[PDB]
Amino acid sequence: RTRQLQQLQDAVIEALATLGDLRDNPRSRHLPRIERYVRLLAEHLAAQRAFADELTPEAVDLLSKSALLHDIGKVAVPDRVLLNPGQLDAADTALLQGHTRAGRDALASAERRLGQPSGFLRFARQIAYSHHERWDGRGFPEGLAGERIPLAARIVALADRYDELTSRHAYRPPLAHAEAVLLIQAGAGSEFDPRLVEAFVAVADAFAEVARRYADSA
Amino acid sequence: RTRQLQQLQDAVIEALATLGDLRDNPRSRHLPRIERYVRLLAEHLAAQRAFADELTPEAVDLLSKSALLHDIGKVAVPDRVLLNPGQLDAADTALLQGHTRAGRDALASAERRLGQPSGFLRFARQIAYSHHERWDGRGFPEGLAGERIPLAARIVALADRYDELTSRHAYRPPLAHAEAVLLIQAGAGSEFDPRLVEAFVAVADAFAEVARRYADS
Ligand SMILES: [Cl-]
Ligand SMILES: [Cl-]
Ligand code: NI
Ligand code: NI
Ligand code: NI
Ligand code: NI
């Protein structure tokens, strides 16, 4: 019926999120992988009582598409910080962390424009802000902890770590799947909601399939 | 229902275009000004028979909204170039110019994803690529001339120059409206299509109003 506009939105968002990665992550399939990793975890969690209210099939879809915007705030990070492979002094680390606030601000201003609130923009905004929060309260930028982190950001944090481990960086090749799994498991209760780790372990073979099929070009 | 999605698209595009200005033009109302300067010109041209085919009222609306993405490509320009206030050596100048190509490529890859015709994406793409072309063939990145520059990019080039003259820079304060008008008239047949200059002259008072009301804080 109104697919024409929904497809146009998806294409535009995909294109521009991709530009937003150009400075620190060019030539990557990060974004379509993250989307699928998020969807898989969200689908599995949706079958369980603790999450089914929040994760309706409509919510799962919006959540997954909004995960594409997690890092659009990186334009607030100067080249010298973003392209520095080494360790950062504390004021530069603060600039790198501010990617979350900048993404949050832009998306919240977009929300205030709408008469009928948008689930899409609300998930996108929660994710952009809170995707580097840690279950134990030691992440950034607010140090939220436990169920005070929005569910969408908790899902994305795990997807994002899996993706980072199983893709290329200047310092190394991707880690093998089995090792990434042990590394994500190790973060249960510190980095990640232990229930999301449990969901991840049940879908991990599907994660390995996405990582292979949507692998970066050589 | 269709409104809900159209309002969502407008909100998201504006947010992302605004993030695209953050590095070299933070705290600015460039984008809402530009959109209105485009719409004003386009609405006047649409009256004319010569442009009326291409500028239907639907096209006017898409054209205007797509103009927001003109400089989205500036993420391909390194900080050291983009933040340099002086004259640029020729290889840095080439990197600055490549904002047009990088915007083009992102929007074309979106047209490929979508795989059906979108007036919105087509306008956006043409604008991002050609908004610094000059009627006399001396612009960049291709040196297109005359009617070989897409109409949308010809409209945006004029709007963009007006905005740049009547807003702040490190070198100077804004030019007064009356002087900016003369200056734009002076570019007829070199920078700009002379028929767009005619249209600009007929809507100039409205341009002055947008410039004042949407002035930077
Ligand atoms: Cl797959
Ligand atoms: Cl006005
Ligand atoms: Ni990312
Ligand atoms: Ni991030
Ligand atoms: Ni601009
Ligand atoms: Ni430009």
PDB file of N, CA and C and ligand atoms in Angstrom, chain B residues 21 24-25 30-31 34 67-68 70-71 74 131 160 163, ligand 5:
ATOM      1  N   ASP B  21      26.518  19.395   8.888  1.00  0.00           N
ATOM      2  CA  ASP B  21      27.077  20.756   8.905  1.00  0.00           C
ATOM      3  C   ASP B  21      27.868  21.000  10.158  1.00  0.00           C
ATOM      4  N   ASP B  24      31.812  22.060   9.944  1.00  0.00           N
ATOM      5  CA  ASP B  24      32.269  23.344   9.390  1.00  0.00           C
ATOM      6  C   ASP B  24      31.284  24.499   9.495  1.00  0.00           C
ATOM      7  N   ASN B  25      30.100  24.263  10.016  1.00  0.00           N
ATOM      8  CA  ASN B  25      29.074  25.302  10.054  1.00  0.00           C
ATOM      9  C   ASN B  25      28.114  25.058  11.206  1.00  0.00           C
ATOM     10  N   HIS B  30      21.526  27.952   8.183  1.00  0.00           N
ATOM     11  CA  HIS B  30      21.740  27.746   6.729  1.00  0.00           C
ATOM     12  C   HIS B  30      20.667  26.894   6.101  1.00  0.00           C
ATOM     13  N   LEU B  31      20.276  25.814   6.765  1.00  0.00           N
ATOM     14  CA  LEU B  31      19.443  24.832   6.074  1.00  0.00           C
ATOM     15  C   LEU B  31      17.992  25.233   5.914  1.00  0.00           C
ATOM     16  N   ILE B  34      18.137  28.011   3.177  1.00  0.00           N
ATOM     17  CA  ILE B  34      18.356  27.516   1.875  1.00  0.00           C
ATOM     18  C   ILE B  34      17.095  26.854   1.291  1.00  0.00           C
ATOM     19  N   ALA B  67      17.193  19.837  -1.416  1.00  0.00           N
ATOM     20  CA  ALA B  67      18.275  20.831  -1.341  1.00  0.00           C
ATOM     21  C   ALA B  67      18.981  20.835  -0.023  1.00  0.00           C
ATOM     22  N   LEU B  68      18.313  20.350   1.022  1.00  0.00           N
ATOM     23  CA  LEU B  68      18.976  20.225   2.336  1.00  0.00           C
ATOM     24  C   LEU B  68      20.248  19.366   2.359  1.00  0.00           C
ATOM     25  N   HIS B  70      22.619  19.188   0.086  1.00  0.00           N
ATOM     26  CA  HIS B  70      23.666  19.656  -0.871  1.00  0.00           C
ATOM     27  C   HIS B  70      25.085  19.403  -0.418  1.00  0.00           C
ATOM     28  N   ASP B  71      25.379  19.605   0.849  1.00  0.00           N
ATOM     29  CA  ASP B  71      26.745  19.537   1.323  1.00  0.00           C
ATOM     30  C   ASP B  71      26.975  18.305   2.219  1.00  0.00           C
ATOM     31  N   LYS B  74      30.522  16.548   2.887  1.00  0.00           N
ATOM     32  CA  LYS B  74      31.674  17.163   3.494  1.00  0.00           C
ATOM     33  C   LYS B  74      32.382  16.294   4.476  1.00  0.00           C
ATOM     34  N   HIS B 131      26.027  21.481  -7.480  1.00  0.00           N
ATOM     35  CA  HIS B 131      25.640  22.766  -6.875  1.00  0.00           C
ATOM     36  C   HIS B 131      26.741  23.819  -6.925  1.00  0.00           C
ATOM     37  N   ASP B 160      22.393  29.312  -2.666  1.00  0.00           N
ATOM     38  CA  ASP B 160      23.585  29.113  -1.787  1.00  0.00           C
ATOM     39  C   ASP B 160      24.447  30.365  -1.757  1.00  0.00           C
ATOM     40  N   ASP B 163      22.799  33.062   0.318  1.00  0.00           N
ATOM     41  CA  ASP B 163      22.899  32.776   1.733  1.00  0.00           C
ATOM     42  C   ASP B 163      24.260  33.092   2.230  1.00  0.00           C
TER      43      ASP B 163
HETATM   44 NI    NI C   5      25.751  24.287   2.654  1.00  0.00          NI
END
